[PDB]
Structure 1
Amino acid sequence: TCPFYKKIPGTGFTVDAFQYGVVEGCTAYFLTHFHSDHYAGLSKHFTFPVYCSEITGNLLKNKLHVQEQYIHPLPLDTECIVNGVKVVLLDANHCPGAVMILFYLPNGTVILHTGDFRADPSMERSLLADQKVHMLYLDTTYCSPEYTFPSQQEVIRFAINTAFEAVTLNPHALVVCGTYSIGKEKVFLAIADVLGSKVGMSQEKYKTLQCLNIPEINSLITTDMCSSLVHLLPMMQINFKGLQSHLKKCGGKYNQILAFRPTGWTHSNKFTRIADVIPQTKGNISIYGIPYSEHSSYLEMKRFVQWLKPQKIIPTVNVGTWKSRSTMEKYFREWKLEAGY
């Protein structure tokens, strides 16, 4: 059945709750972003109002064929009324089109649902600065102190410098980058920009990218693989077997592959700096796992919450085990005692 952490008290609303059938008493279904664990259940047969960003609404129409009459896109950073309740959508610094949702309940309670987010100090100067938030529905993906990672900027600097060196030493090397969802487009776009190439990809992935309102996108991507030396493949093909196979398909144009897997966290992070990352190599194939995250590190999460000072926190991730739930609640109490709220 629908879990309680997907329901907004005092409303008829749910968040990211499309796989439970008709949720009893739900008048408006919000969708924070277009990732499959959150949209699971939507299709052309859905007939309830879906509230989302413009970008998510483009993907619902074009990829899932949801009918236009049930898609209700909202502008960001704008007070809107939905079924009699004031709401605001804020940028979540996750994947394209991802939002956090502020609800202003008729009784005076204010609720923030982060969806999936990567906390940032820039959020301290949005419309969140303007009033008190009482309850926080928090993306707790990496809520433990072992989870450190570098800035996105440091990671992209590493990737650009690595790719440019490799291709300048060998102009017959191909760069491959893995993907299995939207998000992390900076990785492949930044590498293609330094190399003077478009990114080549499947027709399905090109269609998906054309929904994202990215500026000058026609100049950066293509379905013509032959004209490109940065290729995007499914994450599943980013291994020695899959890469050897792909190289065969390129008809002797290339004699080496340098491949990137933008993972979330991996335990080489507790020891190793970004400067010190090395690939796995077999023959003329090298694979780099780079820690490009679109979720908060532990320290980023803690800073956001200690700034916001909510009265009550409701985790939305890692909620399935008692040991995880108890660990998270211990951190919440530490943060509150350190900060004095």
Structure 2
Amino acid sequence: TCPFYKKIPGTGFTVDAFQYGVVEGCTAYFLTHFHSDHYAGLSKHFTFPVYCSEITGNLLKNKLHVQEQYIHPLPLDTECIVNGVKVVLLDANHCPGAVMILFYLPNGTVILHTGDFRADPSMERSLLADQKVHMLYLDTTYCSPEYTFPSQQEVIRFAINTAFEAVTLNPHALVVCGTYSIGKEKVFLAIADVLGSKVGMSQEKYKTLQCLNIPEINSLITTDMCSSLVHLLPMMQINFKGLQSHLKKCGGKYNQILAFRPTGWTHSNKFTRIADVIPQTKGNISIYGIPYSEHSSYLEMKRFVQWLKPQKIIPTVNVGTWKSRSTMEKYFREWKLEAGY
């Protein structure tokens, strides 16, 4: 059955709760963003109202084939009424179309559900600052002090300079970027922009990108692999074997590959700075691991929560074991004692 952390008290609303069949009492299902864990169970067969951003609606319509009658897209940064209750969608700084949702309950309680997010200080001057938030449903993916990472901009700058140098040294090199869902699009778009190229990709991936309201998209992406010097491949193909194989397929138009694997955190965040990063190399193929994160680091999460000062925190990630929950509760108490709420 639908867990209490996906239910909004004193409404018949749920959030990211599609895998449990019909939820008893639920009159509106919210979807924070288009990642399969969150949408799991949604298909052309679903027949209840889904509330979401415009981008998330395009994806539901076109990729999942959810019938149009059940998609209720809402604009960002706008007070809307849903089944008698005031809501606002805010940018989550996660993947394209990802939202946080603010719920103003009839009793006067205010609840923020973050969805998946990368906390940022720009969120301190949104509509959130206008009133007290009593309850917070929090993306706790990286809720432990070991999880540090560089800013997105430091990582993109590194990617840009690396790719530009390699292709100026060898104008017959191909750049490859690995991908598995939506998100982290700036990696491949910034590399292509410094090389004066479009990004080449499969028909399924192109169809996905065409839904995302990216300005001038038709000038940035193509399905003609031949004509482009940055290609997108599935993350699973980002290895020496898969990349040699791809290079055979391109018809001797390239004689070298430089590949990027954008990942989350891995253990080498605890020593290395972005400027020290060196690739793995086998022959005419190099692979760079770059920690481009679309989740809050420990320090970014702590800052946001210490600013917000919620009366109660409800974790939404890593809640499956008592050890994880206990560990998280400890950090929430420390933050509360330091900041005086």
Give the shorter-chain TM-score range. over 0.9
Partner of 1:250: 250
Shift of 1:45: 1.1
CA offsets 1:168-195 (integer angstroms, 9 cap, x no match): 0011110000000000000000000000
Of 115-124 and 277-286, deviating more is 277-286
- Looking at structure 1, the residues matched to 236 and 5 of structure 2 have their Cα atoms a distance apart, in angstroms, of 32
Q: TM-score, normalised by structure 1?
A: 0.99
- Looking at structure 2, the residues matched to 272 and 223 of structure 1 have their Cα atoms a distance apart, in angstroms, of 37
Three-state SS of the structure 2 residue aligned to 1:275 is helix
Shift of 1:321: 1.3
Shift of 1:251: 1.0
Task: Let me know the Cα RMSD of the aligned residues.
Answer: 0.5
- Looking at structure 1, the residues matched to 276 and 4 of structure 2 have their Cα atoms a distance apart, in angstroms, of 44
CA offsets 1:270-319 (integer angstroms, 9 cap, x no match): 11000001111111111111000000000000000000000000000011
Shift of 1:118: 0.2
Shift of 1:230: 0.3
Q: TM-score, normalised by structure 2?
A: 0.99
- Looking at structure 2, the residues matched to 128 and 249 of structure 1 have their Cα atoms a distance apart, in angstroms, of 51
Shift of 1:206: 0.3
Partner of 2:46: 46
- Looking at structure 1, the residues matched to 175 and 321 of structure 2 have their Cα atoms a distance apart, in angstroms, of 40
Unpaired runs of 5+ residues, structure 1, are none
- Looking at structure 1, the residues matched to 11 and 241 of structure 2 have their Cα atoms a distance apart, in angstroms, of 52
Three-state SS of the structure 2 residue aligned to 1:46 is coil
- Looking at structure 2, the residues matched to 278 and 318 of structure 1 have their Cα atoms a distance apart, in angstroms, of 32
- Looking at structure 1, the residues matched to 172 and 22 of structure 2 have their Cα atoms a distance apart, in angstroms, of 55
- Looking at structure 2, the residues matched to 24 and 67 of structure 1 have their Cα atoms a distance apart, in angstroms, of 22
Shift of 1:85: 0.6
- Looking at structure 1, the residues matched to 296 and 44 of structure 2 have their Cα atoms a distance apart, in angstroms, of 33
CA offsets 1:5-59 (integer angstroms, 9 cap, x no match): 1111101010000010001110000000000000011111111000000000000
CA offsets 1:93-148 (integer angstroms, 9 cap, x no match): 00000000000011111000000000000000000000000000000000000000
Q: How many residues in Structure 1 have an aligned counterpart in Structure 2?
A: 341
Partner of 1:169: 169
- Looking at structure 1, the residues matched to 10 and 65 of structure 2 have their Cα atoms a distance apart, in angstroms, of 31
- Looking at structure 1, the residues matched to 152 and 327 of structure 2 have their Cα atoms a distance apart, in angstroms, of 27
CA offsets 1:233-278 (integer angstroms, 9 cap, x no match): 0011111111111000011111110000000111111110000011
- Looking at structure 2, the residues matched to 247 and 318 of structure 1 have their Cα atoms a distance apart, in angstroms, of 40
Partner of 1:102: 102
Three-state SS of the structure 1 residue aligned to 2:268 is coil
CA offsets 1:58-112 (integer angstroms, 9 cap, x no match): 0000000111110000000011111111100000000000000000011111000
Shift of 1:323: 1.2
Shift of 1:3: 1.1
Unpaired runs of 5+ residues, structure 2, are none
Three-state SS of the structure 1 residue aligned to 2:269 is coil
Partner of 2:283: 283
- Looking at structure 2, the residues matched to 156 and 266 of structure 1 have their Cα atoms a distance apart, in angstroms, of 18
CA offsets 1:173-223 (integer angstroms, 9 cap, x no match): 100000000000000000000001000000100000000000111010000
Matches within 5 A, 1:210-249: 210-249=210-249
- Looking at structure 2, the residues matched to 271 and 257 of structure 1 have their Cα atoms a distance apart, in angstroms, of 27
- Runs of 4+ aligned residues of structure 1 deviating over 6 Å after TM superposition are none
Three-state SS of the structure 2 residue aligned to 1:231 is strand
**Is 1:326 aligned to 2:319, yes or no?**
no
Three-state SS of the structure 1 residue aligned to 2:259 is strand
Shift of 1:224: 0.2
- Looking at structure 2, the residues matched to 312 and 278 of structure 1 have their Cα atoms a distance apart, in angstroms, of 43
CA offsets 1:145-167 (integer angstroms, 9 cap, x no match): 00000000000000000000000
- Looking at structure 1, the residues matched to 150 and 302 of structure 2 have their Cα atoms a distance apart, in angstroms, of 16
